[PDB]
Ligand binder design. Structure first.
Ligand SMILES: [Mg+2]
Ligand SMILES: [Mg+2]
Lengths: 436, 437
């Protein structure tokens, strides 16, 4: 005699409580899924990760999470992933379809409107994740596995790599390296040690691929969230991209960027930072330029004077980046950074050569000058850099695919669009000016 | 220098991380409330029947199930955990709000026509809507200690703030007093049936135009946020009106079963005969065959075995709901139809029906005969004959799937009006109305 409910006996409580028992596991399965999505998002945007708090803008939502275990292969261990409002208050847990929707919105926004990922029949990462909820969940690393059994499995996986011409180049990331990350995250063994072991198993094979996998600074992977060429029917059609090679050494002996000499109407000199006092007029020039809106809209470094003063000093003291003032017929008009790719975030994004050089550029005095000038300066700088370093194979740049005038300036200057790449705050057109 | 893949831990770090972990339980409860609100709207806007106990339904690409612990007379149901099931019935996920919003969106966009606003390349989706709302201030919960008398007090004040004639928003009743009765009921503050009675009284007193309507109409206006050809999400929903059953309405009238119409001219019509003996008779055989041909099954989705159909037709013939009939054209048995009383049908929650309203589902088996345009002529003949057969019937209706546009067009050529799109448990339909006046 309950008309809005079911009359309860102990048997009803039993049935419904049995069902409630697996919900603990269901929540853990959603946790593992959201973590997998987040690891991919970080790899595919090449976002750096350190132990401690991670805070990210993903499409329409701010996401934050504790990085409890920072993995050398990207197999990080997270605390609860939370959505924050503008003031930093948690308003939701970041469950898998939520993340899939945020990532999809961010990614579709990152690529150009005419890109395949934005075609009307392309599907979305949400369709993909939705369609996958009933797939069999993959078995977890035995929490009690020994390091020796781990090495045992890792050797069997290395040796079962086809190593034959026409092999999948991403098989190394997808196989042994993914397994290393899972062992590390389970606390089974140190991933640095497991990578050394992996290096040994590769030096023995002496194949084509094994010598390559040990020397090259990047490896092939496959992207499932970021990439202008993605499709979900409703299953994902992944697209290739490059990631840092964990087996590759740290700092090379590559000298700092050279000071080129530009022809035509252009002049170039390094930024000067006075140790004494304000920092000088070069710090002020860059600071002024960097805070104008048309520059901040691309560089997003509208910093105070002193922050810029010590950025420029830090760069000048290093071997990575060389900040310069560019003149046009006697007027200081532009700022650029010439940088060695080998010490740059670009080093994780494409199979670079050790001397590769890149250019970031900001045109400061457009407000009173310049039309057609863009391509001319870019050409002058590219050629002059190849002249200054005969061991440099190419000059490169990564304008936002949405910065269409910049992309066109680079192409008219002779850079070729090699690919789209995913970066922490944008997708870029990778423009390459090659030596011939 | 002790942990390179982690942060060195002191009690202060643990303290910081545990405070943050304290609010997560409330975050999980807030996702629970959000998903429940979405499910309530989905069930209402598709007119899916709900009873206490287990509820199971297909929403787009996923099967959803939940215990209905509290079945609300106003649809403000209380659920146990909402789970996604695979094909064998194994739970594979908890149905959190954005997951629900995505399945409902996929399902709803699929229900409406490709040309509808909800399907425009520039329209929002329910996913955009739910995403954009995560940082909204959460709505106040009903005080658990509220008294029933305070509930009556608030409910009376609320009927009094109803616009009456100026403005005349028809959905104000569902959105105001009825939504509050549901929240009071769901919180356990009072029995909703009693609160509906109280509501009826406060409404007889004013005796304006709207109040007379709200007690007499078998349906009320509500606003849909998930189902509806005209929906838009401009990171915020632009709702569309639709009708829902009126909880203040009595009904249960003494309406007879469907009458047997009489078609003249080239048409004949008679009820199906079901043999008690053996196979079921020749009429069960005809219906069974027709319903399994591909062109008929593609729409009716009842390509059943002979035995199931024999018990379907018998169950209808014994009831007061539906009357299955065989239609002849110039001596050849060519079609099957069901004449049904709307008041006993799924349609009754969908539009302000009159007690004697009649419906028609039709299946053309012998397309090989009367091969072109005769469809609308049969529909017109049936509508007129049904209006003759029951002098108290106000209209003949039909609810083809909005995607079955050939059928929609045939009904319109027969004199039916495509009055609106409606949400039904398994499809959106074009409500075709052949009105007597
Ligand atoms: Mg009991
Ligand atoms: Mg410690």
């Amino acid at each position: 005699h309950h008309s809005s409910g079911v009359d309860l006996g102990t048997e009803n409580l039993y049935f419904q409580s049995n069902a409630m028992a697996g919900d603990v596991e269901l929540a853990d399965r959603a946790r593992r899924r959201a973590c997998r999505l987040l690891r991919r998002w970080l790899a595919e945007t090449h976002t750096p990760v350190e132990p401690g708090p991670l805070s990210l803008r993903i499409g329409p939502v701010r996401v934050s999470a504790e990085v409890a275990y920072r993995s050398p292969t990207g197999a990080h261990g997270f605390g609860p992933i939370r959505v924050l409002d503008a003031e930093g208050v948690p308003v939701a847990l970041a469950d898998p379809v939520l993340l899939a929707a945020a990532c999809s919105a961010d990614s579709r926004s990152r690529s150009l409107p005419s890109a395949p990922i934005n075609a009307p029949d392309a599907g979305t990462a949400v369709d993909w994740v939705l369609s996958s909820l009933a797939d069999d969940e993959d078995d977890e690393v035995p929490a009690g596995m020994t390091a020796e059994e781990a090495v045992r499995l890792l050797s069997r996986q290395v040796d079962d790599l086809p190593r034959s011409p026409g092999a999948d180049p991403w098989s190394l990331v997808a196989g042994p390296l993914a397994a290393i990350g899972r062992f590390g995250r389970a606390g089974i063994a140190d991933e640095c040690w497991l990578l050394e072991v992996l290096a040994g198993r590769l030096r023995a094979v002496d194949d084509d691929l094994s010598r390559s996998w040990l020397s090259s600074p990047t490896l092939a992977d496959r992207a499932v969230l970021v990439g202008e060429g993605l499709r979900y029917r409703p299953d994902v059609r992944p697209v290739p991209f490059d990631v840092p090679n964990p087996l590759h050494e740290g700092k090379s002996d590559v000298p700092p960027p050279p000071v080129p000499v530009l022809g035509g109407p252009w002049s170039l000199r390094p930024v000067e930072v006075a140790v004494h006092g304000d920092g000088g007029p070069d710090v002020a020039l860059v600071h002024r330029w960097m805070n104008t809106p048309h520059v901040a809209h691309h560089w997003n470094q509208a910093w105070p004077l002193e922050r810029w003063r010590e950025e420029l000093a830090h760069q000048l003291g290093g071997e990575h980046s060389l900040p310069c003032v560019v003149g046009h017929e006697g007027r200081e008009v532009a700022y650029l950074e010439l940088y060695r790719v080998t010490r740059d975030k670009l080093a994780g994004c494409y199979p670079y050569g050790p001397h590769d050089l890149g250019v970031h550029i900001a045109i400061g005095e457009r407000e009173v000058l310049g039309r057609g000038f863009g391509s001319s300066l870019l050409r002058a700088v590219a050629g002059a850099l190849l002249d200054a370093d005969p061991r440099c194979a190419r000059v490169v740049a990564e304008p936002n695919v949405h910065n269409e005038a910049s992309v066109r300036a680079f192409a008219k200057a002779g850079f070729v669009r090699e690919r789209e790449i995913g970066l922490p705050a944008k997708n870029s057109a990778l423009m390459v000016f090659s030596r011939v």
